[PDB]
């Protein structure tokens, strides 16, 4: 009786830094067109109460970072999973969808941050970072960069730099 389908077939996914979360309560799941479906670069499960479907898009070689105890730009500054994590990370390549001549500007990630993210935390602020010494008071250039950045997904890209749609079931 549970949805999923609304999560998976979603026409476009979130930017990782504003990752989307759909709540799933009151029902049991069929599965099938998950698991028995192939066309997944990954289908990794680790480890009920209430279930969270967490969707977003990242690069190929960032997918290893959607696992408990991983580090790097994503695991640190965009979407952290707990070590505790009992759940599933399911990912698939979507270059035929989410890549454009120019560099699909629809997918962004947080480049810089003062600290790391807590598990299942989501920071959406765009207040300029302040790398150097001087107080920025809203501007940028000389040190003092702007915190988000585009994936610029282009068809020619190698898999390492291609759009992968990630769904994260969490229990």
């Amino acid at each position: 009786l549970c949805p999923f389908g609304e999560v998976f077939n979603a026409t476009r996914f979130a930017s990782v830094y504003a990752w989307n979360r759909k709540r799933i309560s009151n029902c049991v799941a069929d599965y099938s067109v998950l698991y028995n479906s192939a066309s997944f670069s990954t289908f990794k499960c680790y480890g009920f109460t209430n279930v969270y479907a967490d969707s977003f898009v990242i690069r190929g070689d960032e997918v290893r970072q959607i696992a408990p105890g991983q580090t790097g730009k994503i695991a640190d500054y965009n979407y952290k999973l707990p070590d505790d994590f009992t759940g599933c990370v399911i990912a698939w390549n979507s270059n035929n969808l989410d890549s454009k001549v120019g560099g699909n500007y629809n997918y962004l990630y947080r480049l810089f941050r003062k600290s790391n993210l807590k598990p299942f935390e989501r920071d959406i602020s765009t207040e300029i970072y302040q790398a150097g010494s001087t107080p920025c008071n809203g501007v940028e250039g000389f040190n003092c960069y702007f915190p988000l950045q585009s994936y610029g997904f282009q068809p020619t890209n190698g898999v390492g730099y291609q759009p992968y749609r990630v769904v994260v079931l969490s229990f």
């Binding site: 609304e6 077939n9 979603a10 026409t11 476009r12 979507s94 035929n96 969808l97 989410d98 454009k100 629809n106």
Partner: protein, 211 residues
């Protein structure tokens, strides 16, 4: 991409009614379908977003809904103002898309035109050319019929009509027919008449003059 087919293409309904517009799609979408209202003489206005989202500035007499590939704007308690063209939209993962359009005319009781004929100005005749403008004012439905008769023979080649968009206030139309001759052709006939046939008329109507 992903093509969108809005229907019906035109829709004529009276005040206080409930109208329902559809939009079948090549393929499927979700919080990425959105509806637009282009009033005449006006830019587009966003009405509903993310499929069923109420928006802002728009009243709750407007409401959207849809699954998979079929979507549906509906207006209730139709108002004269509501008449416009309405557009679908889809959003990305390659490709943006609207549809043909859907024109919503506001049905009302038949109103016959008030015809008015203007002969050429002296200014114009000096400058070489004659224009006789017939004017049909404030009528419904659109579907009217003008003829120029000249010394009683039906002139064909050299007139052009222009109807205005339906008028929000009285939900009527107006229309100009304009017969343009050279001054030299203009002087080779005497009577110039403008004959009209609307549904609101029992028998046809002429306004004519002499050169």
């Amino acid at each position: 991409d992903i093509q969108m087919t809005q229907s019906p293409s035109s829709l004529s309904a009276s005040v206080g009614d409930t109208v329902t517009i559809t939009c079948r799609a090549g393929q499927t979408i979700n919080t990425f379908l959105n509806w637009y209202q282009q009033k005449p003489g006006k830019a587009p206005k966003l009405l509903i977003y993310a499929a069923s989202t109420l928006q802002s500035g728009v009243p709750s007499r407007f409401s959207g809904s849809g699954s998979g590939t079929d979507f549906t704007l509906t207006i209730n308690s139709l108002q004269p103002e509501d008449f416009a063209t309405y557009y679908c939209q889809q959003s990305y993962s390659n490709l943006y898309t609207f549809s043909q359009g859907t024109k919503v005319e506001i049905k009302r009781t038949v109103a016959a035109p008030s015809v008015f004929i203007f002969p050429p100005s002296d200014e114009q005749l000096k400058s070489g050319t004659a224009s006789v403008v017939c004017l049909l004012n404030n009528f419904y439905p659109r579907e009217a019929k003008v003829q120029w008769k000249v010394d009683n023979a039906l002139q064909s080649g050299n007139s052009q009509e222009s109807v205005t968009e339906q008028d929000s206030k009285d939900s009527t139309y107006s229309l100009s027919s304009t017969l343009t001759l050279s001054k030299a052709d203009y002087e080779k006939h005497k009577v110039y008449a403008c004959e009209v046939t609307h549904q609101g008329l029992s028998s046809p109507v002429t306004k004519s003059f002499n050169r």
